Amino acid sequence: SRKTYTLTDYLKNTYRLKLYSLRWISDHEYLYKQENNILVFNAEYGNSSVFLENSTFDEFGHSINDYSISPDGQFILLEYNYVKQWRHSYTASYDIYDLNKRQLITEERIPNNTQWVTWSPVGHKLAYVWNNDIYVKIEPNLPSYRITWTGKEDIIYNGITDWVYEEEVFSAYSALWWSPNGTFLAYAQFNDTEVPLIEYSFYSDESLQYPKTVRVPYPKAGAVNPTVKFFVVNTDSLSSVTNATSIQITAPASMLIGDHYLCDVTWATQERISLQWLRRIQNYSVMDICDYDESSGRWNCLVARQHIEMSTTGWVGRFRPSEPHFTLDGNSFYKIISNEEGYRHICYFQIDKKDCTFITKGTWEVIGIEALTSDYLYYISNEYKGMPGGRNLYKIQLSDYTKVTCLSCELNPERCQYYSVSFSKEAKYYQLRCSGPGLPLYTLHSSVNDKGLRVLEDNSALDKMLQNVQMPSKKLDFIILNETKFWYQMILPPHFDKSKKYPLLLDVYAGPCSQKADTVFRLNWATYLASTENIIVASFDGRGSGYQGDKIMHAINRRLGTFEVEDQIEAARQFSKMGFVDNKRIAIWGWSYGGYVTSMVLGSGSGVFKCGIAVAPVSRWEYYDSVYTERYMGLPTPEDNLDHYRNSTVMSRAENFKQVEYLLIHGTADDNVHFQQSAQISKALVDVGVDFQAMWYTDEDHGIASSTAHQHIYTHMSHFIKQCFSLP
């Protein structure tokens, strides 16, 4: 009798999740924007003051995309004129508001088309990047010191990352790293001088008469990669007439025999930096600990102090080598490491010592180390009730590692099974965020005795609303394939009847270390397909999937487009044999790696799927970028892995598409997974006589995320699926 969840509701964002985004600003206080005022909250007692009134800047003349306040909080930075580049990078203008006076600073402004800005971690110093060169303001109203002079568009980058680094390495435009004092500015330089350029058309506005070609240095598998150097400047000794002195830190000798990357930089103390590096064959990584010479002004990294990580089974880390979490003193650290059994767990390392100690063990994995005092290490794992799809917070007593307490497990156990966390400085207080399986819940807690303090957002407004809709439900369970347990979720229509036969949509991603079966609450496309269209949407984590150990995750090492594909069919097969899925109507769809897999499934000849959708798919691994692809596939040369690079393309199995119905979609401005990839699939289908559907989306990138293209793509896919399943 109630309304169902409709496409419109999805697209028009009718039922909205309420969030609670806070920024810890000390051990006991946090920032929060409410009704557009910036507020400081006291964690302990719950009371708040207004940092910055909503009324301030209503005469400022520009609408403001973002802000960032001094640590030692006398300035606020205002970001405006935001122009997006890639996933993390962008260009903007900035003004600085002097909080003590009622004033914008007026002279020495941070320039326009600034590519990155950062406050120092204390005080109110500023580093910014402009035309690929680094600058430093000591005071906001003073002239900046130029640190580098080598910036050249698309060629040399100081303090920012190039495309592959932004995307595959640091998940960030930034390549600047302030000392904890603020004394030093560490920064990376990239040189893309010989990196080949992916070119593509942008058509933009109807009034542009000639298309623009966009040209992006983008190393595809086996191509010349960017090189990198690393520098540290002392920001306390800058002259106005002397060019600043940047000291180089050289990679270790065992990284210099060949192509390598900088994968991680962590400050350990005021005078010690941690630099992890990686070989290009991502087999082998080195952590260097560099100390600062008081007398010399130099940085030395003692060999007897390096830390090596290797794997014979696969690559180092889930996507990159893990991050070290240092003790206050900087003489030791804790870091996630795959154990002997293949399980990622926390290892305690001493800096001068060489082997490490495991602080956790067992048939589950650690997801992150979240805070560390002298007393306690806080982390997230999927230990609870043995569900890898699950996330919870844990507290180790460091005087005895067997005394672990779970902080989130039983706070709201039917409602909350997927937490993330946000500790204040010195882990005095934390916010918890349960992401599912019920409505998201944001709580505030005091570490002292782990007293719950206060609910922040409970989403009850959403709850009252969703009581009036025909919500689908979620089944999280496992099947068995060859002795091992693999998990799947199903999103099930309202009033699911196990005696009926429902159409089933396999929603696939299945990349190395992915997880599509989990406890989180989403309101999405699947929600609509289940509520209105009575379609079971199923998802399944097969070999190559993560959070369940190496045996499963490294199964796909050097062999993408293989066990992850077979296992999707094997599970679709099994869902078929269950007596509520009508095997005549099984479809499959995926975005991105999802598309590559959906296509590899459509082309397997399984005859299990009526039809499916591949959006922005990888079709051939030589088209994708070096850092991601080489991590799973090695190099595409005869001496290495050319054979399997060639064996695993969507085009190789074009004929088999004649048995299936296929919708193939790709935005033309995809800088990530290039249009070329869908353009080689479509050609291969044509070359063989296979009919299919296509959709390009002019000037859309990898996410096809403009308001219109979003509504349109999901509209297009609904029609393709309703009619695939003979639904009116």
Active site residues: 592, 670, 702
Tell me if 37 contacts ligand NAG by CB under 6 A: yes
Spatial separation of the C-alpha atoms in residues 84 and 701, rounded to whole Å: 12
Tell me if 709 contacts a second copy by CB under 8 A: yes
Q: Which does 353 bind (CB under 5 to 8 A by kind): ligand NAG, a second copy, none?
A: none
CB of 601 to a second copy, least distance (A): 20
CB atoms within 10 A of CB 582: 15
CB of 533 to a second copy, least distance (A): 17
Spatial separation of the C-alpha atoms in residues 287 and 306, rounded to whole Å: 6
Q: 20-58 as b/e, with b when 16 or more CB fall inside 10 Å?
A: bebebbeebbbbbeeeebbbbbebeeeeeeebbeeebbe
Task: Write each residue from 681 to 700 as x if it is in contact with a second copy (CB under 8 A), else as -, in one continuous string.
Answer: -xxx-xxxx-x-xxxxxxx-
Tell me if 36 contacts ligand NAG by CB under 6 A: yes
Give one DSSP letter per residue of 242-284, joined into a string.
SPP-EEEEPPPTTTTTS-EEEEEEEEEETTEEEEEEEESSTTE
CB of 469 to a second copy, least distance (A): 24
CB of 694 to a second copy, least distance (A): 5
Pick from 8, 13, 21, 54 the residue near ligand NAG by CB under 6 A.
54
Using a 10 angstrom Cβ sphere, with 0-12 exposed, 13-18 middle and 19 or more buried, the burial of residue 348 is middle
Please report, for residues 17, 56, 114, 323, the alpha-carbon distance to residue 4 in angstroms, rounded to integers and kept in the order given: 18, 43, 47, 45
Tell me if 607 contacts ligand NAG by CB under 6 A: no
Q: Which of residues 202-261 bind a second copy (CB under 8 A)?
A: 203, 206, 209-211, 213, 220-221, 223
Single out the segment in contact with ligand NAG by CB under 6 A; choices: 108-116, 295-303, 419-427, 497-505: 108-116
Q: What is the 3-state secondary structure (H, E, C) of 190-245?
A: EECCCCCEEEEEECCCCCCCCCEEEEEECCECCCCCCEEEEEEEEHHHCCCCCCCC
Tell me if 93 contacts ligand NAG by CB under 6 A: yes
What's the sign of the alpha-carbon dihedral 213, 215, 221, 224? Answer: positive
Q: Which does 156 bind (CB under 5 to 8 A by kind): a second copy, ligand NAG, none?
A: ligand NAG
Per DSSP, the three-state class of 21 is coil
Q: What's the number of CA atoms in the CB half-sphere (13 Å) around residue 609? A: 30
Tell me if 29 contacts ligand NAG by CB under 6 A: yes
Pick from 8, 193, 270, 468 the residue near ligand NAG by CB under 6 A.
193
Tell me if 149 contacts ligand NAG by CB under 6 A: yes
Q: Closer CB to a second copy, residue 143 or residue 211?
A: 211
Q: What are phi and psi of 29, to 5 degrees?
A: -125, 150
Largest Cα span, the chain? 82
Tell me if 679 contacts a second copy by CB under 8 A: yes
Single out the segment in contact with a second copy by CB under 8 A; choices: 198-206, 266-274, 456-464, 467-475: 198-206
CB of 216 to a second copy, least distance (A): 11
Single out the segment in contact with a second copy by CB under 8 A; choices: 26-34, 152-160, 195-203, 252-260: 195-203
Single out the segment in contact with a second copy by CB under 8 A; choices: 28-36, 161-169, 542-550, 703-711: 703-711
CB of 82 to a second copy, least distance (A): 21
**H/E element holding 41?**
strand 37-42
Structure tokens at 440: 């998201």
Single out the segment in contact with a second copy by CB under 8 A; choices: 146-154, 264-272, 580-588, 619-627: 619-627
Structure tokens at 253: 């000798």
Which residue matches tokens 């900088």? 262
Per DSSP, the three-state class of 479 is strand
Q: Closer CB to a second copy, residue 566 or residue 622?
A: 622
Paired with 262 in beta bridges are: 277
Give the distance from CA 504 to its chain's centroid: 29
Spatial separation of the C-alpha atoms in residues 673 and 628, rounded to whole Å: 12
CB of 697 to a second copy, least distance (A): 6
Q: Closer CB to a second copy, residue 465 or residue 686?
A: 686
Tell me if 660 contacts a second copy by CB under 8 A: no
Spatial separation of the C-alpha atoms in residues 228 and 226, rounded to whole Å: 7
Using a 10 angstrom Cβ sphere, with 0-12 exposed, 13-18 middle and 19 or more buried, the burial of residue 355 is exposed
Give one DSSP letter per residue of 546-557, joined into a string.
SSS-HHHHGGGT
Tell me if 428 contacts a second copy by CB under 8 A: no
Pick from 4, 14, 26, 48 the residue near ligand NAG by CB under 6 A.
48
Binding residues for ligand NAG, rule: CB under 6 A, are 29, 35-37, 40-42, 45, 47-49, 54, 93, 109, 111-112, 149-150, 156, 191, 193-194, 243
Binding residues for a second copy, rule: CB under 8 A, are 196-201, 203, 206, 209-211, 213, 220-221, 223, 620, 622-623, 649, 651, 668, 674-676, 679-680, 682-684, 686-689, 691, 693-699, 708-709, 711-712, 715-716, 719
